[PDB]
Swiss-Prot record:
Tissue and organ distribution: Expressed in brain, with highest levels in the olfactory bulb, striatum, cerebral cortex, hippocampus and cerebellum. Also expressed in pancreatic islet cells.
Biological source species: Rattus norvegicus (Rat)
MHD1 domain boundaries: 564-707
Name of the coding gene: Unc13a
UniProt: Ca(2+) 2 binding residues: 163, 215, 217, 234
Binding site for Zn(2+) 1: 38, 41, 66
Subcellular location: Cytoplasm; Cell membrane; Presynaptic cell membrane; Presynaptic active zone
Region of the whole protein represented: 543 to 1407 of 1735
Chain's role: Plays a role in vesicle maturation during exocytosis as a target of the diacylglycerol second messenger pathway. Involved in neurotransmitter release by acting in synaptic vesicle priming prior to vesicle fusion and participates in the activity-dependent refilling of readily releasable vesicle pool (RRP). Essential for synaptic vesicle maturation in most excitatory/glutamatergic but not inhibitory/GABA-mediated synapses. Facilitates neuronal dense core vesicles fusion as well as controls the location and efficiency of their synaptic release.
ZnF Phorbol-ester/DAG-type span: 24-74
Name this polypeptide is given: Protein unc-13 homolog A
Similarity comment: Belongs to the unc-13 family.
Domain notes: The C2 domains are not involved in calcium-dependent phospholipid binding. The C-terminal region containing both MHD domains and the third C2 domain is required for synaptic vesicle priming activity.
Length: 1132
């Protein structure tokens, strides 16, 4: 209150006579060339020694030291000069100028005085009466030196003695003008203290105070003296003082002087002296008075006039920072800051303190950015010519540095706060609040700059980081709020059903387990925000463009927070599977899109393989599962529809049936659903491919199986189209599987998906072999039948250099006759199969058939039932009427015809495979036996009949031979010394005298020229007869001993009658080749055992029925004991 009313009064006084009424003294230096007296002090001006100043405008003559002590303006001092030259009336005139100035001022600017009244809340009547007071303080006070004076006589020291006591009873009189007063008396003292005050009136600075000290005589002498002298109280001394030496308040001691005829004087008097030319010395330092004025005015303007709205001033330039108000108010504070000097920066800091209480009002952040840029520029640069620091010049602020620092920090914090929710506090929908926002960051740069420049702080908070925190803050508050309120937000902001805009359950404003829609909704929220940040805020907040892309900070913050939440969601869905596979696939495309839009290009995530595919992968696998099972049900349907269609070929040249196509179509539709994800994690891809390669393997083996199962039922000799088509299906699987494997990225494929499909292809191959076999096999009975007929037809042909012209019928006619049962079957079927089998299929079929055929002929014709089943039977010791040249031909031509048929010009089998067919080469080889030489055949017999020695069926006795294989010392041939030691167990109890002897024979090749037989002497009546007789066979030199065997035979001697065979044993000379010599018991058989090659050779040697070696061989091997004299039957 005190300061407010003091400042009200001093503002009224300051502006009733505004200092802008005043005029300046144009002084010339002027020589007082005669003794002259100064119009201020009345002091001597004289010569050059004491020159004066003569004004022209005020005219006024004074000391130099007085030309400024001439206090009043050049109007008033022109008046006072005019009174001191002669015209006093000019003084009353300029008193009337002072009146008229104040009347005009009031009448012309009444709004100044009214505003001071309203700002200081004074009434109009009381304002009129305080205005009478400040009018009077310049209008009674228009020209006054009407001093009240208040003289405290304090004390004296060293006074003269005069007393009745012998000391003195000093009192004092004081006089000013005619008026006279006294102290009471100090008694008996020469150093008295009174401290006694006298008020006086003076009307002239050239008056004197008179002060006089008196010894108080109250005695008969003083009662007498009172009749003759005025001063009845013996005078102790005086001082006399000019009123112009006085001012304000004083406390001074003065030495004392004489006056009266009674005077004896010494010492001094102390006087306190007040002089009430003194006025408002009670100044709050005019700073503070101006502040009070300014705060009152500011609240009055903003709050009272403008209802708290900050009216931005009637301001001019950047120096709006110095024009705080409209004219009236501006002139108020300026006439105050002029009359009372208050510096422009102090005025400004006061205004910035005011504004900070309102900083949120529109445009105020631009004004405060301005005002602070200036208060900064002031302390940082204005008078930075002073070597004092900005922070210290700012300390020397009469405002108080600290008060200002606090104020900035509070404000800055309040800005940081508002920025931390920039979106909510400065919505993009208000460009005005986007501009206040922009001007706020301009203010915050201006504060950071003040801290850096005026406070001289070295690392103040960097304006970009300060704001980046606030943005991150505002973004995280946004994210929390969206993740918790997704439905309310997506609801109101976009939702594709108006019934879904409201407070949907929290399990749907955060994550649902039932649906993916919260997440599609959250995706759109995220997009929208990043857009607003990119689009409204990144431009609004461009001050740190390099540091502060609001759109990027948005995309990063929001995705990060999202991706966490989404990953957990996908894991949660995976436990429950309430949404369909498909829904997660749709969500995957949305998420894939979203990342690949906003996120992938932020450096942080450009740096990485996207992790999101790991979220969807189980749902893709679920889909692959649903898919495989559907595909396997489909597979069975397709196979069964095709089966119902009897497995027709898709066309007569599209050799597989339609199910193959359907399946590959399905598998491709399926694969493409996978492929359409393009998962950027190739191991998750690898997993899908492993999963699917299994699907494929399973489906295709299940096909190949369902085929392989039905296959044999179709192999019957009339549905033949169908097994062809099924093998073509199988092969077509392999073929399209190679394609699909390539489509899955071929050799680039996951090694285990690849492992699977390689395994699969190998199994499908092995299936196709077994089908080709099973197929070729169903014709086998027909083949065997036909081949037996061809064998029957061939048996009419014989060795036709030895037969008539119906069987010496040409090699061709015989071959044709022979061939005919098969050529019928062949031509039809191979043509049909060549038309309707895929070449892979056909080749396998044909190999199987070829083998089968070859083997069938080799058996059924070349080692035929029409030969050996006679010779080794009770039937004919066959020739097959000689398998000469002719039936070697016929067959070789038929084989060739067949080989051309199976070859089918390369449409069938390769002439290489056929020529190098073991089936053929064996067949050819058996054919070669038939034409061979007798000794080669006999060699083949002894070498193959190795078993002729190990085991005899029912022995008739045994022979002890000691045999020596001398590689002969006389010739280098092989000779065989057979020492016939004895026989034993001879089953020969004959009716005549028994006379046993032992024959020994040799068997092997090249024995036509050599003694094949020896015999011992006889022994009478003896069934274990000894001989000790030595024979010497010769072998060939060229054939080794393993080409030979002894054939021992005991016999009964009957001269003039006939000798009789008692038994037979074979000793292989292959043993004696090793043993060198051998004592051995040879069990005598009744016959000698053979194998099929003994018998094949014996069938070919029996054809040599005229060759004496082949006769004697066929005879000596068909040689047997008569059962007489010794019991049971032989065995084969």
């Amino acid at each position: 209150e005190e300061l407010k009313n003091h400042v009200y009064k001093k503002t009224l006084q300051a502006l009733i006579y505004p200092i802008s009424c005043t005029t300046p003294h144009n002084f010339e230096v002027w020589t007082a060339t005669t003794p002259t007296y100064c119009y201020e002090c009345e002091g001597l001006l004289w010569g050059i020694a004491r020159q004066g100043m003569r004004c022209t405008e005020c005219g006024v003559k004074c000391h130099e030291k007085c030309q400024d002590l001439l206090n009043a303006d050049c109007l008033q001092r022109a008046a006072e000069k005019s009174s001191k030259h002669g015209a006093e009336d000019r003084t009353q005139n300029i008193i009337m100028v002072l009146k008229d100035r104040m009347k005009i001022r009031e009448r012309n600017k009444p709004e100044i005085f009214e505003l001071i009244q309203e700002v200081f809340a004074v009434t109009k009547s009381a304002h009129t009466q305080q205005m009478k007071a400040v009018k009077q303080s310049v209008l009674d006070g228009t020209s006054k030196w009407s001093a009240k004076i208040s003289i405290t006589v304090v004390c004296a020291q060293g006074l003269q003695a005069k007393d009745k006591t012998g000391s003195s009873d000093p009192y004092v009189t004081v006089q000013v003008g005619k008026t006279k007063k006294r102290t009471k008396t100090i008694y008996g003292n020469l150093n008295p203290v009174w401290e006694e005050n006298f008020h006086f009136e003076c009307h002239n600075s050239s008056d004197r105070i008179k002060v006089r000290v008196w010894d108080e005589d109250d005695d008969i002498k003083s009662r007498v003296k009172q009749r003759f002298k005025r001063e009845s109280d013996d005078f102790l001394g005086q001082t006399i003082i000019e009123v112009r030496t006085l001012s304000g308040e004083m406390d001074v001691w003065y030495n004392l002087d004489k006056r009266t005829d009674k005077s004896a004087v010494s010492g001094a008097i102390r006087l306190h002296i007040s002089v009430e030319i003194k006025g408002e010395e009670k100044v709050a330092p005019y700073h503070v008075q101006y502040t009070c004025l300014h705060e009152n005015l500011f609240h009055f303007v903003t709050d009272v006039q403008n209802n708290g709205v900050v009216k931005i001033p009637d301001a001019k330039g950047d120096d709006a920072w110095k024009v705080y108000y409209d004219e009236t108010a501006q002139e108020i504070v300026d006439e105050f800051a002029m009359r009372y000097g208050v510096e422009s920066i102090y005025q400004a800091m006061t205004h910035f303190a005011c504004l900070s209480s309102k900083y949120m009002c529109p445009g105020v952040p631009a004004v405060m950015s301005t005002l602070l840029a200036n208060i900064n520029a002031y302390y940082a640069h204005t008078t930075a010519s002073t070597n004092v620091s900005a922070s210290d010049r700012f300390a020397a602020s009469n405002f108080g540095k600290e008060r200002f620092v606090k104020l900035l920090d509070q404000l800055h914090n309040s800005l940081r706060i508002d920025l931390s929710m920039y979106r909510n506090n400065f919505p993009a929908s208000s460009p005005e609040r986007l501009q206040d926002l922009k001007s706020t960051v301009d203010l915050l740069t201006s504060i950071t700059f003040f801290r850096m420049k005026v406070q001289e702080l070295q690392s103040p908070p960097r304006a970009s980081q300060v704001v980046k925190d606030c943005v991150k803050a505002c973004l995280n508050s946004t994210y929390e709020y969206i993740f918790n309120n997704c439905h309310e937000l997506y609801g109101r902001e976009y939702q594709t059903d108006p019934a879904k805009k409201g407070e949907v359950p929290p399990e749907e404003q955060g994550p649902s387990i039932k649906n993916l829609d919260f997440w599609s909704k959250l995706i759109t929220l995220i997009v929208s925000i990043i857009e607003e940040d990119k689009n409204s805020y990144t431009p609004c907040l461009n001050q740190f463009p390099q540091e502060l892309n609001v759109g990027k900070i948005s995309a990063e913050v929001m995705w990060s927070l999202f991706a966490q939440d989404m990953k957990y969601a996908m894991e949660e869905h995976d436990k429950h599977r309430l949404c369909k596979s498909a829904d997660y696939m749709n969500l995957h495309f949305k998420v894939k899109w979203l990342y690949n839009e906003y996120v992938a290009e932020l450096p942080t995530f450009k740096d990485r393989v996207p992790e999101y595919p790991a979220w969807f992968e189980p749902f893709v696998i679920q889909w692959l599962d649903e898919n495989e099972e559907v595909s396997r049900d489909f597979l069975h349907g397709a196979l069964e529809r095709d089966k119902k269609d009897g497995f027709q070929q898709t066309s007569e040249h599209a050799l597989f049936s339609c199910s193959v196509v359907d399946v590959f179509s399905q598998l491709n539709q399926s694969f493409e659903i996978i492929k359409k994800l393009e998962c950027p994690d190739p191991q998750i891809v690898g997993h899908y491919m492993r999963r699917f390669a299994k699907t494929i393997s399973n489906v295709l083996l299940q096909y190949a199986d369902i085929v392989s199962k039905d296959f044999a039922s179709y192999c019957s000799k009339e549905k033949e189209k169908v097994p062809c088509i099924l093998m073509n299906n199988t092969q077509q699987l392999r073929v399209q599987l190679e394609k699909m494997f390539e489509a899955m990225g071929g050799k680039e494929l996951d090694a285990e998906a690849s492992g699977t499909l390689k395994e699969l292809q190998v199994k499908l191959n092995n299936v196709l072999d077994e089908l080709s076999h099973v197929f070729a096999t169903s014709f086998q009975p027909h083949i065997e039948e036909c081949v037996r007929q061809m064998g029957d037809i061939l048996s009419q042909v014989k060795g036709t250099g030895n037969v008539p012209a119906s069987a010496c019928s040409s090699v061709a006619q015989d071959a044709d006759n022979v061939l005919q049962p098969i050529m019928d079957l062949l031509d039809s079927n191979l043509t049909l199969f060549a038309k309707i089998c895929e070449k892979t299929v056909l080749k396998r079929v044909l190999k199987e058939l070829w083998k089968l055929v070859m083997n069938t002929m080799e058996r059924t014709i070349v080692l035929p039932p029409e030969f050996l089943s006679k010779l080794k039977d009770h039937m004919v010791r066959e020739e097959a009427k000689s398998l000469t040249p002719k039936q070697c031909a016929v067959v070789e031509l038929a084989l060739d015809t067949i080989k051309q048929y199976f070859h089918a010009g390369g449409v069938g089998l390769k002439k290489t495979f056929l020529e190098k067919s073991p089936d053929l080469q064996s067949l050819r080889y058996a054919l070669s036996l038939y034409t061979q030489a007798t000794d080669l055949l006999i060699k083949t017999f002894v070498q193959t009949q190795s078993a002729q020695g190990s085991g005899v069926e029912d022995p008739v006795g045994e022979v002890s031979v000691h045999v020596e294989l001398f590689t002969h010392p006389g010739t280098g041939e092989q000779k065989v010394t057979v020492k016939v030691v004895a026989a034993n167990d001879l089953k020969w109890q004959t009716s005549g005298i028994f006379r046993p002897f032992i024959e020994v024979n040799i068997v092997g090749p090249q024995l036509s020229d050599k003694k094949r037989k020896f015999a011992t002497k006889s022994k009478n009546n003896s069934w274990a007869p000894k001989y000790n007789e030595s024979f010497q066979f010769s072998l060939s030199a060229d054939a080794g001993p393993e080409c030979y065997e002894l054939q021992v035979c005991v016999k009964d001697y009957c001269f003039a009658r006939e000798d009789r065979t008692v038994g037979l044993a074979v000793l292989q000379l292959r043993e004696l080749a090793q043993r060198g010599s051998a004592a051995c018991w040879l069990p005598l058989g009744r016959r000698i055992h053979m194998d099929d090659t003994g018998l094949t050779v014996l069938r070919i040697l029996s054809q040599r029925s005229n060759d004496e070696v082949a006769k004697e061989f066929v005879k000596l091997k068909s040689d047997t004991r008569s059962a007489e004299e010794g019991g049971a039957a032989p065995a084969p």
